[PDB]
């Protein structure tokens, strides 16, 4: 009918191929991002673990620059291309303007690149969605989301991937100014949000924590277990 | 390009389950659409081309209706099939011969010209944008070390050298008659070659010919330039055959 | 005297038998999925 | 269903790429390949498919290729596409060496090839490569390594994996017979022989049905060699004797 | 299902390409050809489609030389064979110009197969409907290869292809020896060609070419007749 | 259900039912029009069902001024009691999920009324033939196992070609519409049935209809065996549309 | 019934030797509003009827400006009209720059036809769905030309295009013999009376739904809208 | 019957025919009739030009073009294609004159335009032309010449030709003329008479006769017939109708 | 259509068999939900409750008049139902691609002075799979013996089959189609042969013809399918028949109302000038 070509309108004004592309995001691993006052936390749950594998090569949290991070959910092979293009653009922006890149700027670049692939019948869109956190030049934390159609908009705390509605409802209920008072409180909030879907914490969760004027830091299973125990207390 | 038709029969770049292309065979069938027949015979020191000449109307100008062309000063030709396709291929052959002469400093040989045409024609069989031309070309000429030469190429892109070939509607009967004649004997003079070439067509079509119903082109060792015979000479040959 | 199926609304460069471009009409219909906006022009200014 | 199979640039109503799925399904017919990581070396064993009586043996190997002074690879799928991919891998390694005056790391080479493989699943009019790869090598950043790639353009690092025909049973047996941090080269060879014997139900193993490659580090140099029929026969005989003693 | 049998760039749900199988079927419906590697040479034999008195013997041949030490024969379509022969000659000349030594057989086979692979991955073309047999002699060691329409090549010791090639293969299996000579190989090739022949074989309807340390040579009709009379 | 055109429905004990199938090119429908026009059958009732798109027009087989104004609907039933024949004509297309229920209702009516045999005229796509089918006649047939032995004897004497089977053996008829469903349900319910079809393509499909009608006549012997044989209905005009605009040519 | 296969593209001939897409595109002209154009021995006049979406929107403009001696009127699509107007303006500008002379209307309309013929033969294109009325003045006097989506142009003395223009054409044919002697007055009146025949018998012409364009011997192309039309509308009769 | 093989110009029917070209040739018979007769010392053309409405000028949408100083042209079929082909012919003649410095022979021009027309029946990205046309010329060293080109791309020389809706009756009428021994002044009247005889008034409301010759009278130039001679020819034809 | 060079494409089919020839619980649930999304509901707007009985089963009927399209409903509103008291009885709710909400309405009225006279003003579009539900919910199962039905609609002039060109016809004009049991005579020529009519009016005529109910259908072939004065004035001759003789009282005031409502038309998309 009307759902086989990218540039064909439905009789009621629908572009079904882009919606089908977005449907592929809803099957990946859940991702959670929470913005604090002096810290930004990203959390991704491990869909499954194989004992005969190296966990270093299957990470879903990447660093785009000194003050920008990224987490995705969708098609793994498609995510890598976007990540590499974003890294090149981040380095090239400094060559023209001495100041470091801004979170809104890099989100705009990623959204435009994603939109460029939904304009013709000779190529298919990217089936991924991303969460971008970081710090501005003057020191203002940010958090943005991007969609395969090419739209972006800011948030305070969001969740993408499969089983995201429950996590978003939990964050809406449990987000307040006295819950992001300190870094430990923010990290525990992210862990509690992820624990609603993960069958057993500690083994199926990975966290990345970035502080102001500091590089990305990846927590290890020891620290994750310690926080889980403190929450369970 | 507006796509490719679906089916084992409706496109040039689609193989049949038995492994054969059908558009090429249909292009072969398109040769018999004109309704004429051509015969070429090679002699000891000459080569002759004979073909039919049908003028249906009475308001037509018979001077402008012909099927014998001239590629270079020493190469003849005869075409069977669609008229426009035949003329287009003739123009391409002329251009290729001129280019070869410019690039190499001497006249192109008949086999080289036939091979070039066949190589060009093969490309149309392997691409979805172009289609084969429904015609076949027969060339005659004289080599330096070797004597007369007769060559033929087909829409599929296959060419070969012969002693006496034919093309058109009555190709099979003409081939059988020529096979019998060649197996019997091959040492022929200039007069004998023309006589047998005319006799083959006459006995296959079962028609008593007239001087204005055929056209003949010859190449001889004494005069290696392509020449088209006139009505008086054709009538003289016909009278000699009848007597 | 039979009823059959005909399609003209799956290409941007196709004309309906009555000279109608249907893809443009569908694109116009796509607007009705947005949010309402009101603009009033007055001799003192413009309101949006 | 049958409506969203025409080309690679069509999304199913639930976001699926059926052409890529079929391309990945095409790998299930080729021969079986193995890769095991040990403490002092890495291993790569493959099953020979060309076993006709009238064939010849002219080449250095049938499925094992050398890409670099420090790496090697094994293919499974379509030979025509495997040849192109192998040539491109060699060119990429030489380009990096010319640029930086240092050998290329294994993960970088794998990523560079997987980008090329993924590029054919996005632009319509082309057909994806139906090949899977297994890489082994040594690197100054992480030591011995073992990777795997598939027609989708994905990759990941493993400690013991298998691709090709009857892969599931081999993976299931490896997952219970491989012990992390305590594997030596001899133990890896014995495990590979046992797994190949179980997963090949055609007949009893013979030295002319398998080929085994070994990568080790010896006095500041990486040596890659292919075991000979004598060693393979000794390994098979020892395994058979062990099985006989087991009962 | 016939939904995947028309387009070249489509995978069947079982992970198969069908148009390439149809090209192979086209190859398997041509005239027979046989290649046997002896201890000190290689022999190639084939039928010819003319089989008539009006054909001119100097016009077109099926066994053709690439270099002083390489020749080949085909089975399938002829127009597709000519272009590949021309490309192979050009590649050999380029290699000689760059490296100042004749090209090995394996490199030539690899490059020809790489050329043939390109036509099986893009929409808008069709694969070559021909298969090739290449013989050579390098470092005092004969070679024999076969290249498929898919772009895949194998190294053989004795093979047959074309019409009725399974029976030819089993015949060769029954009567092949590893310590043969050139004359014995020629006799075996003629016999296995006669197995699938229907008419009366003469010296005017088969082609034979050999390759030893001297070079690649195409046997004259008188020599073929003498060999045919030897086995009666 | 069958709604009579008068007061009480007639009897159809021992009659032969001729019906089309909505297939590629409307070949079956055109053949039914030719048969009804030639034999001059009279309407006896309708077949009201909610499985076809409704349509209305005047009498398509008009021959005089008096009968040129008679309403018609998308499904009508004609009969000729002298030869014990009855025909069904469909002039529309099927809705999405209303093919199998329609086939079930039609076969139930056929079983209940008391007919003897059923003959179905349809077609198939001509671009799906392999090499063997490109060399043979474009006409095929099928029979059910419950058919009378005299029928297969006559068919074998006629030297016809049977439809080839494929393996999943199963019968596959691309572009045939409801022919496969009718055949399978008739085999299940043990009803005598025959299917005749041709390999056609969409376009001008008058010669295909004429050929199919002659193919049927070789067996049923409607006319004497051998231009004026079949009477073209008056409705077969302006098939390509209206006239030319003035200032174009 | 049999037409479904041969009416989806302009590169396909019907079995009756007809291109159906051209005939379909010719029907877009009748989707606009009526336009009337006539000429006299000295002047050329264009009259157009404007429609509005609602009472709170300005009426769409129909008469455009091409050069100091050429003007056009539009009936059909809008994007095609804009593209053609740009082409006309560019050609006139280039001719004036190069030769220091005005571009003749005959040459201009020939260029229009040559450009418009192309998209009716190649794949991936559609014909222009717009019809134009051109009024100009040069050394040969006044001119009125008509253009068709089928890349056909005619040289007229009085023509009307749009929706329900048959009445206007009938009136022009009946009163054709008096046009060549009228001055600007009574010529604009003849045009207005011809345009009034395309309306229902109850309603009349106001000053908010008519546009006038005049070009003459020593008067450049001018457009009269809104209050500028009252002098021409003063003398009309009560729709006899 | 060629259903299924008639949607592109690069498809062969199972009996070896291209049906798009056949449909294009069929399309020519949708227009009025034009004839051309070659005589001892010139060529004269005649076109039956229908009238659409009385609102058009006298010289609107003509069907007789001036390709060069010595060549005329008459068309039939779709008009836009006729204009395009006239432009092509003018360009070819101008290019030859610029290259070689003398008037182009008629046979060469016919060959060039015929090959250009034929080039459109080979690819699937375009469609064949839908018009036929004739060319005529005269020179002291060559004499009168006449040619026809059809949408398939085939050209021939003629002594008398006719294209359009009613070519058969026109050819029958022409075949009764001894055009080899007459003069243009005696051929204008015959052309007008044939045009009047062929015309059908039941399905065609009205028409205007259009004439033009080239020959020795015009000193090797293609010109429109003077009005008085047109009037005399029309009067003679009307008298002969009775 | 081909998306890349050399793509294999298939010809479209006019019999519609290319889609239904292809015949998990989630799929069945999706199909059931989609079927439930576009069902026909008849309800009383006074209390927003559905009528469990067919509309004509609750109330006896003697005359039924149906108008389809903007022009027909405008004509009926201006000329017929401006001179009496009519009560709304029920309304229908539909959803499909071309009618997103229910300008789109389908409302039934019955005369207060004579409760045996009904009306129906349908301006929405009923899809091909919702017409039989409409017939079932309006007429029911057992019809009535004594009842007369009149139907009005509009069609574009390009749908008329004629030997001459379409543009040469003097549009608009009227045509009629009546069942066998309709004893009276129409005021316009009956429709020519090769022409057919489909969709909802065809459904009503088929029902009436099968179940032996008198009926008549009036068609207007016009060159302007929007709301236009000429198109609605073309329906005037119908007022002389017995179906509408006793319902018209004042023509000038109806003309004034028509003129008044002609000045409050919907905004047309600015595609054409």
Swiss-Prot record, chain B:
Residues with PTM Phosphotyrosine: 158
Subcellular location: Cytoplasm; Nucleus
InterPro entries given in the database record: Ntn_hydrolases_N, Proteasome_alpha, Proteasome_alpha-type, Proteasome_asu_N, Proteasome_sua/b, Proteasome_subunit_alpha6
Pfam families per UniProt: Proteasome (PF00227), Proteasome_A_N (PF10584)
One term of GO molecular function: RNA binding
Entry's Gene Ontology BP terms: positive regulation of canonical NF-kappaB signal transduction; proteasome-mediated ubiquitin-dependent protein catabolic process; proteolysis involved in protein catabolic process; regulation of inflammatory response
PROSITE patterns, A to Z: PROTEASOME_ALPHA_1, PROTEASOME_ALPHA_2
Main function: Component of the 20S core proteasome complex involved in the proteolytic degradation of most intracellular proteins. This complex plays numerous essential roles within the cell by associating with different regulatory particles. Associated with two 19S regulatory particles, forms the 26S proteasome and thus participates in the ATP-dependent degradation of ubiquitinated proteins.
PANTHER family assigned: PROTEASOME SUBUNIT ALPHA/BETA
Protein name: Proteasome subunit alpha type-6
Source organism of the structure: Homo sapiens (Human)
UniProtKB/Swiss-Prot annotation, chain D:
Membrane spanning stretches: none
Annotated localization: Cytoplasm; Nucleus
Modified residues (N6-acetyllysine): 126, 175
InterPro entries assigned: Ntn_hydrolases_N (IPR029055), Proteasome_alpha (IPR050115), Proteasome_alpha-type (IPR023332), Proteasome_asu_N (IPR000426), Proteasome_bsu_CS (IPR016050), Proteasome_sua/b (IPR001353)
A Pfam short name: Proteasome_A_N
Assembly behavior: The 26S proteasome consists of a 20S proteasome core and two 19S regulatory subunits. The 20S proteasome core is a barrel-shaped complex made of 28 subunits that are arranged in four stacked rings. The two outer rings are each formed by seven alpha subunits, and the two inner rings are formed by seven beta subunits. The proteolytic activity is exerted by three beta-subunits PSMB5, PSMB6 and PSMB7. (Microbial infection) Interaction with HTLV-1 TAX protein favors NFKB1 activation.
Protein name per Swiss-Prot or TrEMBL: Proteasome subunit alpha type-4
Chain's gene name: PSMA4
Curated annotation (Swiss-Prot), chain F:
Annotated localization: Nucleus
Cellular-component GO terms for this entry: cytosol; nucleus; protein folding chaperone complex
Family membership: Belongs to the PSMG2 family.
Tissue: Widely expressed with highest levels in lung, brain and colon. Moderately expressed in muscle, stomach, spleen and heart. Weakly expressed in small intestine, pancreas and liver. Highly expressed in hepatocellular carcinomas with low levels in surrounding liver tissue.
Protein name from the UniProt record: Proteasome assembly chaperone 2
Chain positions with Phosphothreonine modification: 137
One of the GO BP terms on file: negative regulation of apoptotic process
InterPro entries listed in its UniProt record: Proteasome_assmbl_chaperone_2 (IPR019151), Proteasome_assmbl_chp_2_euk (IPR016562), PSMG2_sf (IPR038389)
Pfam families linked: PAC2
Entry keyword Phosphoprotein: yes
Oligomeric and partner information: Forms a heterodimer with PSMG1. The PSMG1-PSMG2 heterodimer interacts directly with the PSMA5 and PSMA7 proteasome alpha subunits.
Post-translational modification: Degraded by the proteasome upon completion of 20S proteasome maturation.
Swiss-Prot/TrEMBL keywords: Chaperone, Nucleus, Phosphoprotein
GO molecular function, one term: molecular adaptor activity
Disease / disorder: Proteasome-associated autoinflammatory syndrome 4: An autosomal recessive, autoinflammatory disorder characterized by panniculitis and erythematous skin lesions apparent in early infancy. Additional features include hepatosplenomegaly, lymphadenopathy, autoimmune hemolytic anemia, fever, generalized lipodystrophy, myositis, joint contractures, and mild motor and speech delay.
Gene that encodes it: PSMG2
Curated annotation (Swiss-Prot), chain H:
InterPro entries listed in its UniProt record: Ntn_hydrolases_N (IPR029055), Proteasome_alpha (IPR050115), Proteasome_alpha-type (IPR023332), Proteasome_asu_N (IPR000426), Proteasome_sua/b (IPR001353)
One Gene Ontology term, aspect cellular component: extracellular exosome
Main localization of the protein described in the UniProt heading: cytoplasm
One Gene Ontology term of the molecular function aspect: ubiquitin protein ligase binding
N6-acetyllysine: residues bearing it: 54, 203, 227
Subcellular location as annotated: Cytoplasm; Nucleus
GO biological process, one term: proteasome-mediated ubiquitin-dependent protein catabolic process
Domain of life, source organism: Eukaryota
Protein's UniProt keywords contain Iron-sulfur: no
Keyword vocabulary terms for this entry: Acetylation, Cytoplasm, Host-virus interaction, Nucleus, Phosphoprotein, Proteasome
Matching SMART domains: Proteasome_A_N
Induction of synthesis: Down-regulated by antioxidants BO-653 and probucol. Up-regulated by bacterial lipopolysaccharides (LPS) and TNF.
Family matches, as Gene3D superfamilies: Glutamine Phosphoribosylpyrophosphate, subunit 1, domain 1
Positions of modified residues (Phosphoserine): 240
Pfam families attached to this UniProt entry: Proteasome (PF00227), Proteasome_A_N (PF10584)
Function noted in UniProt: Component of the 20S core proteasome complex involved in the proteolytic degradation of most intracellular proteins. This complex plays numerous essential roles within the cell by associating with different regulatory particles. Associated with two 19S regulatory particles, forms the 26S proteasome and thus participates in the ATP-dependent degradation of ubiquitinated proteins.
Family from the record: Belongs to the peptidase T1A family.
Name assigned to this protein: Proteasome subunit alpha type-3
Annotated source species: Homo sapiens (Human)
Gene that specifies this protein: PSMA3
